[PDB]
């Protein structure tokens, strides 16, 4: 599923991400834009042998088990396939676990390089929320 910008903003707000760990809703929508282009099925392979999955590109070395990544920790305790659903619940629940640590949203590299420090509220403007 490819979410529309405001559609995703509404879903993320409903999933309790607005101000989660102090990160405004715009941060999360901007993250999804640059991590997955709002595509719930997005998957990207990394040269370190891991693979990123879903709307928020959660990593197979630390967060989910895909059975093909050496050094797997599966901290969210889920199969990486769970992160590829049209339903963002699993991705949100795992993202909440990830962001709760001190590094916060810096875990998301595309967010770090494209969203962090920018006018992220722009990502939710024009949306009925």
């Amino acid at each position: 599923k490819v979410f529309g910008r405001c559609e995703l903003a509404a879903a993320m707000k409903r999933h309790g991400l607005d101000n989660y760990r102090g990160y405004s809703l715009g941060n999360w929508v901007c993250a999804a834009k640059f991590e997955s282009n709002f595509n719930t099925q997005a998957t990207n392979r990394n040269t370190d042998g891991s693979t990123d999955y879903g709307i928020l590109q959660i990593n197979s070395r630390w967060w989910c088990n895909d059975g093909r990544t050496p050094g797997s920790r599966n901290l969210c305790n889920i199969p990486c396939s769970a992160l590829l659903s049209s339903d963002i619940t699993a991705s949100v629940n795992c993202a909440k676990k990830i962001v709760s640590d001190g590094n916060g949203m810096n875990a998301w590299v595309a967010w770090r390089n494209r969203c962090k420090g920018t006018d992220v509220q722009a990502w939710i403007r024009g949306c009925r929320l």
Partner: nanobody
Amino acid sequence: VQLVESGGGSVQAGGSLRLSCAVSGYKDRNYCMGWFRRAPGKEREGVAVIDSSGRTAYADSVKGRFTISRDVALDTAYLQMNSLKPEDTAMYYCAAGWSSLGSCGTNRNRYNYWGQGTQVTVSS
């Protein structure tokens, strides 16, 4: 940062082509290099990337057929495309981007320097 690309063109299915990409402007070799392609009517897809350690990652659609290599000290990368298929037809773009503790991936948004690209057309 500047990118110079070469190679590409027309070829019959089952054949091969080699693309090259030379980068200039970086202060060190701590960056990512990769190829992204845009098939007609589709969005750009990352197909092969390589880090400063020579490690690689590929899109499932090209694994085994495409091989990316990089002469790190020369800031140059190559894409050896063997056993081409019609579905491989597209504008191919070399791109350079931010590495993350030496790792590189196929997400186009993490690449901030792009070039003119090169057309690759595979006839059946």
